[PDB]
Symmetry: D2
Subunit: 115 residues, 4 copies
């Protein structure tokens, strides 16, 4: 599992459950090609997006559908979505975790890249 997404809710102090996440890979013509997607689990995690063989070097975009998440909780949010855009690089450690901490008018994101 070379790419995992973890989403936390800073208002409720909980995992962010049932958040839609869409991953795209930048094509040669600079468009964003769908690559993988899913919804976070009860633990705020989304595993199984891709495989080692498919996850080649390149630029990827992880879009987290924060607007729908907040609206489902009856809360009015600022952003359309959170976006995390990065290069996958084979010289680095194997496993990428993209974490995001969500508030209605703010978000944090970090990368935890490990062997």
């Amino acid at each position: 599992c070379p790419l995992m997404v973890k989403v936390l809710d800073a208002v409720r102090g909980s995992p962010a459950i049932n958040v839609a996440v869409h991953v795209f890979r930048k094509a040669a013509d600079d468009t964003w090609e769908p690559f993988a997607s899913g919804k976070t689990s009860e633990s705020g995690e989304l595993h199984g997006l891709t495989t080692e063989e498919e996850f080649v070097e390149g630029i990827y975009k992880v879009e987290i559908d924060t607007k729908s998440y907040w609206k489902a909780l009856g809360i009015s949010p600022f952003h359309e979505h959170a976006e995390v855009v990065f290069t996958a690089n084979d010289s680095g450690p194997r496993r990428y975790t993209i974490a995001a901490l969500l508030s209605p008018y703010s978000y944090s994101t970090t990368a935890v890249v490990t062997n």
Copy 2:
């Protein structure tokens, strides 16, 4: 000034100076049209991107060029850029400050929205 961007550097404990910022607005055909651009000053602020007349309702994307920023500091960061995507002015004109706090493998961003 209805759209302002402020950027801090969490490694140095300073404003993030000379950070390039590109703003786009979603057009009728659903593509991202260039809207305004600039770079942060010695205070880490970027003023003068747009005017109240030109900053109409729409979905805007503020791209903060964090990789170019870090690369000028000889650092090799994780993200390409920070993207901040939001609907603006859909309840009338507001003033928006997009703030960002940068680290090489992480960033935070928050919006301060005020009603003149």
Copy 3:
């Protein structure tokens, strides 16, 4: 103004107004001595805590009373307060801005340190 505190509310997208702040300094005997206090203004800023003469070298603790802030908004938050503990002025006088971004179960804090 050599010590300034700025607080934002990540739920409302606004300055965090009326946030109480208490500053302490570690004394010779190793206890936390009260040093200054105040509350954030309508801009979320707190100025005038101290003076360059009184803000000598030492270890300071800036307590931001996030629970009292949230409780005045009828919200029940997680933390008691945010504590920011740092050595100041140990390479000569500097100006410090302690910034904080608040959510009910989370906060961020960063320092901007400048040399006059």
Copy 4:
């Protein structure tokens, strides 16, 4: 395991390994009594701090020794330590995770409180 601490490094994009963490419980006379301590593991986690029976309602302080962490990496940091102060409350969910994301002049912290 009612109390767990997770620490991440935003400069390296990694768990923060071998960070000392000290937990205190506020005594009746308003002093901070040592309660538990340890060092984060290779995954940036510190488990086994306390037990359900010992972790009673009250105010706790988790001090994360960030200054020593940065200095061991040859980096000059701002804070003496990061401090997370909160009330444990039985009406809430059972398990408290205190997460912190560290930079030299900044840190983030959130609580993930679950069943």
